[PDB]
Structure formats: structure tokens, C-alpha cells
């Protein structure tokens, strides 16, 4: 299988620097053009930089020219993006993309990594507080039951939430983060049948890379 795994994304201060990486595997790295593309928080997609199969030819968008540098090591199946002189504009999700290898002109990007997040801010990293949400003691059991998890007071984005380490995938809503007084908050709900809980165990898993946090909160009745 084709894979592109980006990494290197972090909270950086303005005027700072960062190096992103994309490890490729499952296809001939050097038979394909590669690009970086970013997605800003308003969700525009902006192509950033491209590099030819050989690494001889590069081209950059106007907003990053003279500050960013794209490069490839064909021996290591790795694509790089060196960012310097970072501004707030540069806050985004950065995706590594592979171009199709068709003849007779320029190509589409047929495969994309999951993306790596980059936040440019003078603000400080804060780990989240994670709180279980169990139903109130007077509530009525009617077949389904909803539990949840509140993730409060962190910076920057993102956090990742899962339920029973991935074993619980359906009946899950994880709500986008909302910023207040320069700290993010989100929540996630999960709905299961009343028999399964509290008999079996329901746990939310919360990870916050930028503060190296990982919490597993078991949802217990009151």
C-alpha cells in the first residue's frame, strides 16, 4: 500500500522555524513529483511548493518564496519542508501529496498524507483537562445511553479523541474545538445500548501531542 506519513508539526513562535517531513512507502518515490499543500483554518486549500522527481527543479507559491524550502532525499523516501520566518498566516494543516506519473503534461495529486498541524503563536502550550460525563443519578434508562467526555483548556489544536481505543466507532460525535479566552475546548459523546454499560467498560482516550499528554478517562456511574 501507498503511504505518506507527515510529521514535524508543532506550536512555533512568530519568526521561528520548523522542519516538516513526509516518509513515503509502497511506491517508487523517485518516479513522482511531490507537493506540499496547506489548509488554513477557514478551510481554503493553498498549494505551497512543488519538487520534481529528480529534486533538480522546485517552485514555490508567492506567500512562501524566500522563506520556505522544499527538498527531497530519494535514498530515504523522504520529502522535507523547511520553514523559516514564520507568521500567523502560516498556521495550517500541511499535507504532503504525490503527483500522478502520467505523460503529456502536468498532473493531479493522487495521494495525500493525513496532514500535520502547525500553529504559529506567541501563546504557551497548555495541556487539556479531561472530565468524564456520566448521566445524572435521577435519569431514565430507555434502551440507549449517552456518555461523554469534556476536554477543556488546552492549546494549541489538535487533540484526538477515541473511545475504547477505537473499539467504539459508531454512535460517536466529536465536536469541533471552540476557542475562548485563548484556550480551546471540545467534547465528545458516545451512545451505546443500556445493557453494555456500566457492565462493560467505556473509556475516552485523549491525546494532545504538543504537550505530550495522553489521558484515558474511564466513565463511571455516580
Amino acid at each position: 500500500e501507498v503511504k505518506l506519513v507527515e510529521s514535524g508539526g508543532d506550536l512555533v513562535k512568530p519568526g521561528g522555524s520548523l522542519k516538516l517531513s513526509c516518509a513515503a512507502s509502497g511506491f517508487s518515490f523517485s518516479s513522482h513529483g511531490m507537493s506540499w499543500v496547506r489548509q488554513t483554518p477557514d478551510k481554503r486549500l493553498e498549494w505551497v511548493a512543488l519538487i520534481s522527481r529528480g529534486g533538480s527543479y522546485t517552485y514555490y507559491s508567492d506567500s512562501v518564496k524566500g522563506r520556505f524550502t522544499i527538498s527531497r532525499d530519494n535514498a530515504k523516501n523522504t520529502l522535507y519542508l523547511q520553514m523559516s520566518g514564520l507568521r500567523s498566516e502560516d498556521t495550517a494543516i500541511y499535507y504532503c501529496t504525490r503527483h500522478k506519473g502520467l505523460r503529456r503534461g502536468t498532473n493531479a495529486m493522487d495521494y495525500w498524507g493525513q496532514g500535520t498541524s502547525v500553529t504559529v503563536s506567541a501563546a504557551k502550550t497548555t495541556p487539556p483537562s479531561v472530565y468524564p460525563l456520566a448521566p445524572g443519578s435521577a435519569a431514565q434508562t430507555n434502551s440507549m445511553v449517552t456518555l461523554g467526555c469534556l476536554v477543556k483548556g488546552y492549546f494549541p489544536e489538535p487533540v484526538t479523541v477515541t473511545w475504547n481505543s477505537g473499539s467504539l466507532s459508531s454512535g460517536v460525535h466529536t465536536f469541533p474545538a471552540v476557542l475562548q479566552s485563548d484556550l480551546y475546548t471540545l467534547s465528545s459523546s458516545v451512545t451505546v445500548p443500556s445493557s453494555t454499560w456500566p457492565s462493560e467498560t467505556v473509556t475516552c482516550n485523549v491525546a494532545h501531542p504538543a504537550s505530550s499528554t495522553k489521558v484515558d478517562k474511564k466513565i463511571v456511574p455516580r
Binding site: 517552485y59 508567492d62 493531479a108 493522487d110 498524507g113 460525563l133 461523554g148 459523546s189
Partner: protein, 217 residues
């Protein structure tokens, strides 16, 4: 630098029906008979997926209900028949002239039957109470249509301060929406009152849906 304008900005279609969306280029994207216009699908929390390359051509792995036509400066993506799993933002891109550039995207939403929300209310966790905070959380799950209003009340009295709201994108299985609403206060203030209530008002019902939590039990 070529500019791509997409129409419409959003579109709503029923399951099983046809959807078409346009892309206009500021100058031609043609060369060698080929057109260098590509279409991508981005579902929330996922990277863009290539659907159609070079205007006409279907990428391998993609259902035949997707198709593209056009030439020069005018291109369309057709989805027929539309399915639940096609909720997404769609973008056109040109690769004829560097820099490569993207349209501003088109949001595809599904029409379906009205559905009332399931509402759940959650008291503060005791671990939160120990740190001096108190959040009360209300989920309003799996409703249609998207528009909805939520009101908090403490011992009868409405509160607007310390309320944070967030909405999911449309679901790709049942095509519904969801919302959470959080109310944050001090432990101190939380302990002075008894009755905490979220009141949802939604097209589905003439009466508000009330869920409530009482500190007396």
C-alpha cells in the same frame, strides 16, 4: 495566476437525485487537447481525495456515479445518483500554469426528513469540582434540519455568560446534525443553585425540549 470560481457555494440535494457543480477559470487551462482541471473531495477530518483528473477521467477506486465535463474555462462535476456518503466539500484545481490553484470549494448537503434531537444533560464531574470549575454539558444529537436554539436556565433564570456551543458537520450515515452546549461557572456559584436546565427549540416541535439536572436529586 489563474483564479477559479466555483458555483454554487453550497448545494442541497435529496438522496438518489442529481447534483452538478461548476468551476469557472479566469483563463484557459487547455493544452495538447487535454484540459488540466481536477476535482477533489474532502470529508471532514480527512485529506482531500482525487475524484476526477484532466476534466473527464475517473480516478481508479471511485464510484461511477462521479463524472466530469468541460473544456477551456468552464467545467462541471456531476454526481448521479447522490448518496449519504457524499457529504463533503468539493474543490476544483488547475495544474496548467504554476502556481497550482484551487477553487474556494462547494459544500454538498443532503435533504432528508425532519428529525427531532435526542437531548442529554450532564452534571459536573467531581474531579472538575475539586479544581474550582463546574461545567454542565448538553448534547443535542441527530437532528434535521440544522437550525436549532439552546437556552440555559438556572433556577428558572436564563444565563448567557459562560456558554460555549459547537456543531458537527452533517453525518455521512444518517445525514443528521449534532450539537453540544457547555455552561461553565465557579464551584462556588454552582453550589448556590439547585436546578440546571437546557432548553432546545427546533422546527420539529412547537414545544421546546427540556432536559434538567437537580442538585437535590
Amino acid at each position: 495566476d489563474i483564479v477559479l470560481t466555483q458555483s454554487p457555494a453550497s448545494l442541497a440535494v435529496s438522496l438518489g437525485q442529481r447534483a452538478t457543480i461548476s468551476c469557472r477559470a479566469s483563463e484557459s487551462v487547455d493544452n495538447y487537447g487535454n484540459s488540466f482541471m481536477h476535482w477533489y473531495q474532502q470529508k471532514p477530518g480527512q485529506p482531500p481525495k482525487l475524484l476526477i483528473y484532466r476534466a473527464s477521467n475517473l480516478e481508479s477506486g471511485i464510484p461511477v456515479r462521479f463524472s466530469g465535463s468541460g473544456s477551456r474555462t468552464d467545467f462541471t462535476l456531476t454526481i448521479n445518483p447522490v448518496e449519504a456518503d457524499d457529504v463533503a466539500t468539493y474543490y476544483c484545481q488547475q495544474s496548467n500554469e504554476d502556481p497550482r490553484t484551487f477553487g474556494g470549494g462547494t459544500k454538498l448537503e443532503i435533504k432528508r426528513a425532519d428529525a427531532a434531537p435526542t437531548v442529554s444533560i450532564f452534571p459536573p464531574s467531581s474531579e472538575q469540582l475539586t479544581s474550582g470549575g463546574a461545567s454542565v454539558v448538553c448534547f443535542l444529537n441527530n437532528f434535521y434540519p440544522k437550525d436549532i436554539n439552546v437556552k440555559w436556565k438556572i433556577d428558572g433564570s436564563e444565563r448567557q455568560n459562560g456558554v460555549l456551543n459547537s456543531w458537527t458537520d452533517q453525518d455521512s450515515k444518517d445525514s443528521t446534525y449534532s450539537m453540544s452546549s457547555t455552561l461553565t461557572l465557579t464551584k462556588d456559584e454552582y453550589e448556590r443553585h439547585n436546578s440546571y436546565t437546557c432548553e432546545a427549540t427546533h422546527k420539529t416541535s412547537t414545544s421546546p425540549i427540556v432536559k434538567s439536572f437537580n442538585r437535590n436529586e
